[PDB]
Scaffold this active site. Structure first.
Site, mmCIF file in Angstrom:
data_model
loop_
_atom_site.group_PDB
_atom_site.id
_atom_site.type_symbol
_atom_site.label_atom_id
_atom_site.label_comp_id
_atom_site.label_asym_id
_atom_site.label_seq_id
_atom_site.Cartn_x
_atom_site.Cartn_y
_atom_site.Cartn_z
ATOM 1 N N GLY B 93 0.776 -1.217 0.000
ATOM 2 C CA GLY B 93 0.000 0.000 0.000
ATOM 3 C C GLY B 93 0.810 1.272 0.000
ATOM 4 O O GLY B 93 0.252 2.341 -0.259
ATOM 5 N N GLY B 95 3.045 2.162 -2.132
ATOM 6 C CA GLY B 95 3.073 2.734 -3.459
ATOM 7 C C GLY B 95 4.122 2.160 -4.376
ATOM 8 O O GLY B 95 4.661 2.868 -5.214
ATOM 9 N N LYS B 96 4.410 0.860 -4.261
ATOM 10 C CA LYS B 96 5.495 0.322 -5.094
ATOM 11 C C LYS B 96 5.033 0.162 -6.541
ATOM 12 O O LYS B 96 5.783 0.470 -7.471
ATOM 13 C CB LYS B 96 6.055 -0.995 -4.500
ATOM 14 C CG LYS B 96 6.976 -0.778 -3.332
ATOM 15 C CD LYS B 96 7.579 -2.089 -2.842
ATOM 16 C CE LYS B 96 6.536 -3.149 -2.499
ATOM 17 N NZ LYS B 96 5.354 -2.647 -1.727
ATOM 18 N N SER B 97 3.821 -0.344 -6.770
ATOM 19 C CA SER B 97 3.389 -0.496 -8.144
ATOM 20 C C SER B 97 3.100 0.849 -8.783
ATOM 21 O O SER B 97 3.444 1.050 -9.943
ATOM 22 C CB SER B 97 2.181 -1.408 -8.211
ATOM 23 O OG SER B 97 2.618 -2.742 -8.298
ATOM 24 N N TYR B 98 2.460 1.774 -8.057
ATOM 25 C CA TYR B 98 2.135 3.070 -8.644
ATOM 26 C C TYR B 98 3.372 3.733 -9.220
ATOM 27 O O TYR B 98 3.317 4.364 -10.283
ATOM 28 C CB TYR B 98 1.496 3.984 -7.605
ATOM 29 C CG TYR B 98 0.988 5.298 -8.157
ATOM 30 C CD1 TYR B 98 1.725 6.464 -8.011
ATOM 31 C CD2 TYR B 98 -0.240 5.375 -8.825
ATOM 32 C CE1 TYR B 98 1.256 7.658 -8.502
ATOM 33 C CE2 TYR B 98 -0.712 6.569 -9.314
ATOM 34 C CZ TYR B 98 0.043 7.705 -9.150
ATOM 35 O OH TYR B 98 -0.400 8.914 -9.626
ATOM 36 N N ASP B 233 10.300 -4.611 -8.946
ATOM 37 C CA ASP B 233 9.158 -4.311 -8.083
ATOM 38 C C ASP B 233 9.101 -5.370 -6.980
ATOM 39 O O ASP B 233 8.700 -6.515 -7.220
ATOM 40 C CB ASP B 233 7.876 -4.279 -8.913
ATOM 41 C CG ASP B 233 6.687 -3.747 -8.137
ATOM 42 O OD1 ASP B 233 6.883 -3.325 -6.971
ATOM 43 O OD2 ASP B 233 5.564 -3.733 -8.708
ATOM 44 N N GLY B 236 6.115 -6.722 -0.484
ATOM 45 C CA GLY B 236 5.975 -5.761 0.605
ATOM 46 C C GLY B 236 6.923 -6.067 1.757
ATOM 47 O O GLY B 236 7.049 -7.207 2.211
HETATM 48 N N1 LIG Z 1 1.660 8.929 -5.309
HETATM 49 C C1 LIG Z 1 0.432 8.435 -5.450
HETATM 50 N N2 LIG Z 1 -0.552 9.173 -5.908
HETATM 51 C C2 LIG Z 1 -1.746 8.673 -6.048
HETATM 52 N N3 LIG Z 1 -2.041 7.441 -5.747
HETATM 53 C C3 LIG Z 1 -1.161 6.613 -5.256
HETATM 54 C C4 LIG Z 1 0.158 7.073 -5.071
HETATM 55 N N4 LIG Z 1 0.856 6.079 -4.591
HETATM 56 C C5 LIG Z 1 0.032 5.067 -4.488
HETATM 57 N N5 LIG Z 1 -1.181 5.383 -4.870
HETATM 58 C C6 LIG Z 1 -2.328 4.464 -4.875
HETATM 59 O O1 LIG Z 1 -2.363 3.783 -3.658
HETATM 60 C C7 LIG Z 1 -2.333 2.388 -3.756
HETATM 61 C C8 LIG Z 1 -0.912 2.002 -3.456
HETATM 62 O O2 LIG Z 1 -0.688 0.678 -3.817
HETATM 63 P P1 LIG Z 1 0.514 0.303 -4.631
HETATM 64 O O3 LIG Z 1 1.075 1.484 -5.115
HETATM 65 O O4 LIG Z 1 -0.005 -0.727 -5.467
HETATM 66 O O5 LIG Z 1 1.514 -0.211 -3.599
HETATM 67 P P2 LIG Z 1 2.349 -1.459 -3.460
HETATM 68 O O6 LIG Z 1 2.499 -2.171 -4.695
HETATM 69 O O7 LIG Z 1 3.484 -0.792 -2.972
HETATM 70 O O8 LIG Z 1 1.586 -2.082 -2.457
HETATM 71 C C9 LIG Z 1 -2.567 2.095 -5.191
HETATM 72 O O9 LIG Z 1 -3.915 1.817 -5.511
HETATM 73 C C10 LIG Z 1 -2.063 3.350 -5.839
HETATM 74 O O10 LIG Z 1 -2.665 3.512 -7.098
HETATM 75 MG MG LIG Z 2 2.970 -4.047 -5.858
#
Ligand SMILES: Nc1ncnc2c1ncn2[C@@H]1O[C@H](COP(=O)(O)OP(=O)(O)O)[C@@H](O)[C@H]1O
Ligand SMILES: [Mg+2]
Ligand SMILES: Nc1ncnc2c1ncn2[C@@H]1O[C@H](COP(=O)(O)OP(=O)(O)O)[C@@H](O)[C@H]1O
Ligand SMILES: [Mg+2]
Ligand SMILES: [Mg+2]
Ligand SMILES: [Mg+2]
Ligand SMILES: [Mg+2]
Ligand SMILES: [Mg+2]
Lengths: 352, 352
Positions: B93, B95-98, B233, B236
């Site tokens: 959560g 933000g690794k994928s974003y 990527d 977590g």
């Molecule tokens: N900088 C950002 N701005 C807007 N939305 C974000 C940002 N970073 C993350 N998010 C949103 O928050 C959630 C973060 O999850 P994700 O980025 O998938 O994290 P991870 O893969 O690290 O768990 C996602 O749904 C993402 O789209």
């Molecule tokens: Mg991810």
């Protein structure tokens, strides 16, 4: 390496069966004898594929018979890091496409080399060798070049350039990396499609590149051999014919050399874009072969004699095929031997 | 080359807005200050991307702000023949994928490097330089390797091997040659699809290969530079976590060296398939960078401090990036100089 020449005889076509036109061609092993319509001119070649009546045993040459004798050669050549080339030559209707490409039920050389190349590329992946394959497919008509692997259908003209590392090349001709036979055939049946009409005065060049990587697991180093196979489908030999007639010029000039005539006059590769692009496949760095295709029909006798007399001249062309390795490895080898020779002369001169 | 470390702060998620959870993270230029929940621990990095509230000017870092600072670096690195690598690190959560991939309306680094690589590959084709691009995309989950570019969906396991010319490699991992950004995205949005559930404990490795051919038109010779970009990527950070924890080990052992501690104890790359495949991207031949992503929420404070304390250690890792040219060219160069040195000693010894 002299250019290897086959002759293939097609069956009598429908009009000739109806009219019961007479066969003037016959084949005895590697000799083909042109009888009079009414002097019977006899020519000998490397092979002679009689494809006239399927209902025979010792005589008939079908498509996989042609491939075992020729496709298997060019295939071996590629893996050993050679440039190879097969030209189909002869009159319209004599069978140039059937032999190069074939029909859906009778595949020619090109689908059979493709099938057999990936079958052997897949059988020799072994952690000491890998293979990358690229493919290109250009058509030449009216001394312009089109890309038959262009998916937008522009039929745009591409200009020919010269190069000190590539040689003459077609600028902007796509080279598509491919990993299976289905990759190419799903681009290349559309390339056979995208061909002009009014259709038989154009040349198709199909070029497959095999990059053979080799690993010295003891030395930890890597080298790459590259073969190039060019499968050339000419116009009918019967500014629209500049390439074809120049290709006539260039085959005689070459055939004269080695025979020792006009050793000093230069082969005019330059004039047509066809002879200039295939410069190297004609007396150059290429294991080159030619398939003269003829009609057996007596109504074709004159183009048949033309084609048999081209095929006879091309067999005197001398090729200079070398293995496309790395210049550097041999440069190191000879430098190290000078170091060893010079280190001995040093202790052979300390005593003074 | 020390490993470059960014930190990115994401916006408060929905629950945190509803609950009005408190921000414990703040950013001052390249410093990020972890406040107490209720000692405020302060860390400095190479960059600090505040992505918390878009309605700002001097502060906000959106996706193309991240790309200008990092993607543009790794892109330049590739064309100069370097291996480059970006790891995204942090809790689920955070933000690794974003950041790595982004969403359809907010593309991350991977579509933006791809777009910008073909835009620059196309702008520097110039008859002295050509570029071939290959791409691979593997996922690692439960110390097994799957191919996300496999179109049959087998989700088959591929074994990791070692090699004296390639190093550790995944046997049977497809490498797809690609000529436009649409070629990759039409395979690779299906690769983001083909990912496991129960989903956040797997690592995705996206690897693009840029082969830069250079032509000495005066000398008539040709060489090839190869860059490799790996976009990693992680799972977590919060036998399922063998890779992640081993990656913890390997970052501290390295960070200790250069700092001069345990110089003699060996970095345990071997244990997990993740640290072993990315061996070279960690203290090896790689311009490597890391993106620690954190939540600003006070309920995440403990994983946030973990992540900030990993990011702080990784900045002490020393990289040994060299330009992946041809061994032979330098071997010739030094051999020729021995020949010149030995030829002088010969005439410096004739007088005796
Ligand atoms: N900088 C950002 N701005 C807007 N939305 C974000 C940002 N970073 C993350 N998010 C949103 O928050 C959630 C973060 O999850 P994700 O980025 O998938 O994290 P991870 O893969 O690290 O768990 C996602 O749904 C993402 O789209
Ligand atoms: Mg991810
Ligand atoms: N050996 C053969 N066996 C059966 N059919 C043939 C053979 N050779 C040619 N044909 C058929 O005869 C016609 C010959 O035309 P084609 O081979 O296209 O010649 P080209 O391209 O030389 O004009 C084609 O329709 C072809 O399919
Ligand atoms: Mg034809
Ligand atoms: Mg060739
Ligand atoms: Mg003929
Ligand atoms: Mg890399
Ligand atoms: Mg975090």
């Amino acid at each position: 390496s002299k250019v290897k020449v086959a002759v293939r005889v097609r069956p009598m076509n429908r009009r000739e069966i109806d009219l019961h036109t007479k066969c003037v061609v016959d084949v005895e092993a590697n000799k083909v004898i042109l009888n009079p319509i009414n002097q019977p001119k006899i020519f000998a070649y490397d092979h002679c594929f009689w494809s006239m009546d399927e209902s025979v045993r010792e005589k008939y040459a079908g498509q996989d018979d042609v491939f075992k004798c020729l496709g298997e050669n060019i295939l071996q050549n590629a893996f050993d890091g050679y440039n190879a080339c097969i030209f189909a030559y002869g009159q319209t209707g004599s069978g140039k496409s059937y032999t190069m490409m074939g029909t859906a039920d009778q595949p020619g050389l090109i689908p059979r080399l493709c099938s057999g190349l990936f079958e052997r590329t897949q059988k020799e992946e072994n952690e000491e060798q890998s293979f990358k394959v690229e493919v290109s497919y250009m058509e030449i008509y009216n001394e312009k070049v089109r890309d038959l692997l262009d998916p937008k259908g522009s039929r745009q003209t591409l200009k020919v350039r010269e190069h000190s590392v590539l040689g003459p090349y077609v600028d902007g001709l796509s080279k598509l990396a491919v990993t299976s036979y289905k990759d190419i055939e799903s681009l290349m049946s559309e390339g056979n499609k995208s061909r002009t009409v009014a259709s038989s005065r154009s040349h198709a060049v199909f070029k497959i590149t095999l990059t053979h990587t080799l690993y010295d697991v003891k030395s930890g180093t890597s080298g790459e051999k590259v073969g190039k196979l060019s499968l050339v489908d000419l116009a009918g030999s019967e500014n629209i014919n500049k390439s074809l007639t120049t290709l006539g010029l260039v085959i005689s000039a070459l055939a004269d050399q080695g025979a020792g005539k006009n050793k000093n006059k230069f082969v005019p590769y330059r004039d047509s874009v066809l002879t200039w692009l295939l410069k190297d496949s004609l007396g150059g760095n290429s294991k080159t072969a030619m398939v003269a295709t003829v009609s057996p029909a007596a109504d074709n006798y004159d183009e048949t004699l033309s084609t048999l007399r081209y095929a006879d001249r091309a067999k005197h062309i001398i090729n200079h095929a070398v293995v496309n390795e790395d210049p550097n490895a041999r440069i190191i080898r000879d430098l190290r031997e000078e170091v060893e020779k010079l280190r001995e002369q040093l202790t052979k001169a300390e005593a003074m």
